[PDB]
Symmetry: D2
């Protein structure tokens, strides 16, 4: 399984990183035009949140070197001009943040790539998949797909398990989200005039933000269509975010029973995707945690037999980056 | 109205500051045994969040000097030993955090103080009052009372207005809360071994926390008893906190109607307590805002006609501090 | 004195705000093409550091409205086209960061501006001035000038006084610097690929940075040319930076005497530019302090009678912005 | 070597951790009365900076269990009451911060411990030892020693190398120091009324601080007595600090040569203690680096052939904790 990476940013680089540890998938090419090979290597060797790269990194003959493996590096603004074909790339991890329609992402297909995974929710009707939730509903005919957002990957397993046993009538979600590259260090104009709040100083603000993440749950779980939505607060934190789902349940239950059901899934049919802790955890405890969702039993509570607050952690960078690789293997195999 | 301050902390010093800009109330006496007079002045003079004290601040003969006015300074650990009576104190602002029961707080009365306000939720059944909400129900025969928490002061006005018109069936609250003095700069043991998470690094964590702030709305508004509770996440922010109320209503509404109902309350009955904004605000926009609650119209949303997320901001330090003075004025006059 | 502003960023907007107060200078025109008018009002009305604009900000018919005062707003990329002459502009504040040569800035003269001040050090041999130091050496024939950097404005007053009285033989400088717009919220590529370190996450890092600011003190004080240089460390701080000057003196001295000579200057001829304190201050105490440099007596020390560490604070945004105005007024009168 | 730990804080817990990977040293007993067993397991297991403990941490029958190995846990305020003798403790890591005196530390010897290491500079005459610089001078008859400060362990190796080769005429230091447990989350009164600035908000401030770490280098390298001193600035950073030495040299040198000397020291006699890099590094890159000092070639510079600014990083927590073990093993074998 040969992977290509378009946009060697936080997601691009950590996807590269997770892929090094996996035997079944291999990175063969990278593209980023805001980055010379000298600069690119620097940014990969050092990382402020996840530590240094697990082995030596040099460049040679326009390639990137990780032991006995060469990796092509390109610097093209236009995806139609990236030579994926010559590297026999099976899947392109589209992680720039600006090619989020079927039309724009199909430019990768023109360059010789077989299939594409947007590392974000699409702006159009592109099919969305969450590993562990609806990934088996994929078929090889779909060449361009989305792996949703980190928040959707955190929310979907939690909702699926609660909905199958108890039945979610309606739910509203809040995610307290770690910092992202779309934000600014000092009050300034946000990109293209959209989302003014995200241009406000990241270091000292709680910043309200819209998200479709919870509304997207209805795409990967049709049954919950129109039954979920939410908002986000961005806060000055390196990585790790948390979802807080307030939902009303059809079948009544104590909080103890809800927790045990989530424990059952995390230990059985959702091992590796959904996790369960009863510890007094805080955000830094999930730095570099590869799961999509870790239910925090003690943070949440119940108002009554039918109204619950359910709390789940996620490393927005690491968890998600591992899911891109899982999906990339799945669609190719 | 002659005020005394026990515990010259974040609340004590900002209570002193607010009272400096009011003619109807003045601080005559201060007690803090963990603070010598030179130290006290220094801490009053400078402030990391709210700037330098708007005044020449000095001391002489054991008195604090704010312009042409002398303030009495004490340093007893036992409140019983503070000569409040000789300073002719009408109300004592109990802002130490360690005298939150009617038995402990009554020693101020034994020191001569006529009345006491607990600047926090009580640990017993001491009466709780929130300006704008139930302060007219105060009986002068009550010598010791509590002004609740900053979070309750934010949530109750919001909940009141919404419940008066639409009726709240149930509700769960999250507050994303700024930093407080019970937290630690690096990972350590929390005082008494209680609330382990709050001992974790304040600078780099999202920290789950319990709170009775929502349950206690039921005390100030009996009609909502058993219908509200919540949780909190602490974040590395200087001041300003935000409440997210997910509530289910009986009378259906569009989001715009709910917003309008809050607007008219804010410009009418609850003017000065509850505020309204449709601007793209972030937390630092409410530093030194003296309102108890500021509804953020564009940050909230509705899922359907009976299920809402309503967002409100508060300067947990400065808002609450002015509330302590309005309650001090009320229970005296 | 009619001022125009090119680039409405941190320095652009803060010059604007500084000017609003003063009765001897006024902003008549603004230009910034990465900013729609509605968005410009938003950035002007709210500030994460210096609080809400002390006045109603609106717009109508393409004009910025401050109360009832109309300010003209353009969105041009070629300063030649900005109609400065139409607005009778005496000085243009060049605060984009990308017109720092004589060739580039002189497009403002062809647009009708009478003179230009660069809000940064120049790339070429454009004359540099610092108020209090060498501003009297400016002659009216010079149409394009520079106000240097915030750091140079901090150091040069301190440098002049120490060298005037004692004689600086050599010296080296570290500034610990607040965060600036050239930095990123998460690890990424810095612009143009210059200074890889500045692209590293700003929230969690101490980031070494080059600075010519200390070498630039030679150009404003020829006598010290070759005898000073230094480096910088960027830290997660909103505003306020500190200079730390290690230096050797020709004539020997005690720390007290050095300190008293700075006190004499700060309360005498350099009043308003160089300040002095013996208080136990921290960076937040100089937020919105309009002086160029404030010497911190207790923070510095001597090793011997010829070798000293001298410490001085500066709000790198506010002090500098006010300096820009002083220069503008000076060069016009 | 059987190690005991009094004070299970940042240094205590990370000393425990480093030992877990060392065969030449083992922890048999811990004392910390501010933290019961359930709480102590939590703090060991989770770490906000260095990640989770790399092992299952549990407890039974009053013992801390790291796998099969049982560790005794006392809760004793009076260090003379700890029964170190019953556990055959060779060395006590005295890392509480409140027993920095021969007389006070010697109460560990009454408990049965053979020897004691102060994890900090002493308040009295106690012998200081930096590994790699002066440790070989230790005599087995000295039962109580100090391992100096993180800052001194960073500057000493550098100063040694520079002085041996070029001759340090005089020097002044500045350290930018990561956050420490003596600071406060919000403006407050520091312990004992000492160091007022350390009580100011850790999250939002650059905070000046005194330090004898530079002067103490003259104690471990007598040739440098009276030639070094300096100051510190605290910044909102989890761990990793930097030293900035401005020094005059007796023999003139090109900066390239000064770097080359440090390189061969780091690859030869000071391998493991003193490090060297030419990479564009930032503070986060040295998290969990076990060296005491990492020279940063590109950060520093020279003013002339005699006057240099030399820059070096250190993980104040992890580097130091590793040196405590080295000293413990050395004073026992
Ligand atoms: N970081 C997260 O928490 C997170 C989680 C899940 C999904 N995502 C999504 O992944 C995407 C990338 O996010 P990120 O956080 O890595 O942002 P980022 O800014 O760190 O990375 C984007 C990278 O793409 C590069 N790029 C820009 N234009 C390009 C072009 N024309 N061609 C090729 N490369 C280009 C940039 O130089 C940059 O390195 C976004 O859509 C984001 O929403 C982010
Ligand atoms: N800061 C907020 O966001 C906020 C908002 C609302 C309510 N409160 C409440 O107000 C109370 C104080 O909060 P704070 O943040 O100001 O805490 P703080 O640490 O800033 O202040 C507590 C002060 O009490 C003093 N003190 C301790 N023991 C004392 C005693 N024995 N006698 C006299 N003084 C003593 C301390 O010296 C300290 O200055 C708490 O109960 C808190 O819940 C805080
Ligand atoms: N903030 C400080 O501490 C400080 C202090 C001293 C000097 N400076 C200098 O002042 C300059 C500006 O810095 P800043 O901090 O305001 O950064 P900033 O990003 O806040 O300001 C730049 C602004 O200029 C605008 N702009 C960019 N290109 C433009 C163009 N070609 N035409 C018109 N407008 C354009 C942008 O919209 C932006 O708002 C820099 O050169 C900086 O070195 C900054
Ligand atoms: N943290 C650093 O960057 C660093 C680096 C070098 C040296 N040091 C030194 O190490 C010492 C400890 O620092 P820290 O950062 O670990 O502080 P810390 O606050 O994290 O740890 C101190 C521990 O001692 C415990 N304690 C208090 N009184 C006690 C008593 N009577 N008996 C037993 N335990 C008691 C506390 O509960 C706490 O857990 C300080 O003197 C400091 O100067 C710290
Ligand atoms: N360079 C900006 C790319 C980008 C755009 C959006 C995000 S998001 O995760 O906030 F949606 C992250 C990064
Ligand atoms: N001195 C610490 C006392 C204290 C105790 C509690 C708080 S709280 O507002 O977080 F509940 C704040 C301060
Ligand atoms: N309990 C606080 C103990 C302590 C005391 C001092 C420090 S210091 O490293 O700043 F000198 C660190 C920790």
């Amino acid at each position: 399984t040969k992977l290509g990476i378009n946009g060697f940013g936080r997601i691009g680089r950590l996807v590269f990183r997770a892929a090094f540890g996996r035997k079944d998938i291999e990175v063969v090419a990278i593209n980023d035009p805001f980055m010379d090979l000298n600069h690119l290597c620097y940014l990969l060797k050092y990382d402020s949140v996840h530590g240094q790269f697990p082995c030596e990194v040099t460049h040679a003959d326009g390639f990137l070197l990780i032991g006995e493996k060469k990796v092509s590096v390109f610097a093209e603004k236009d995806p139609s001009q990236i030579p994926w074909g010559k590297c026999q790339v099976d899947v392109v991890c589209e992680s720039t943040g600006v090619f989020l329609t079927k039309e724009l992402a199909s430019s990768h297909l023109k360059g010789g790539a077989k299939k594409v995974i947007m590392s974000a929710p699409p702006k159009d009707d592109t099919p969305i998949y969450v590993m562990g939730i609806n990934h088996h509903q994929y078929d090889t005919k779909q060449l361009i797909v989305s792996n949703a957002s980190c928040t959707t990957n955190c929310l979907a397993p939690l909702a699926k398990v609660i909905n199958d046993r108890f039945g979610i009538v309606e739910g509203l979600m809040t995610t307290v989200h770690a910092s992202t590259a779309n934000q600014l260090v000092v009050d300034g104009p946000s990109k293209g005039g959209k989302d003014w709040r995200a241009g406000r100083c990241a270091l000292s603000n709680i910043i309200p933000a819209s998200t479709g993440a919870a509304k997207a749950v209805g795409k990967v779980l049709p049954e919950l269509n129109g039954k979920l939505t939410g908002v986000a607060f961005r806060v000055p934190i390196g990585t790790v975010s948390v979802v807080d789902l307030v939902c009303r349940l059809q079948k009544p239950a104590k909080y103890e029973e809800v927790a045990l059901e989530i424990k059952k899934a995390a230990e059985g049919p959702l091992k590796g995707i959904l996790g369960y802790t009863e510890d007094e955890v805080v955000s830094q405890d999930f730095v570099h945690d590869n799961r999509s969702s870790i239910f925090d039993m003690k943070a949440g509570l119940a108002l009554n037999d039918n109204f619950f607050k359910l709390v789940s952690w996620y490393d927005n960078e690491w968890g998600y980056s591992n899911r891109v690789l899982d999906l990339a293997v799945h669609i190719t195999t």
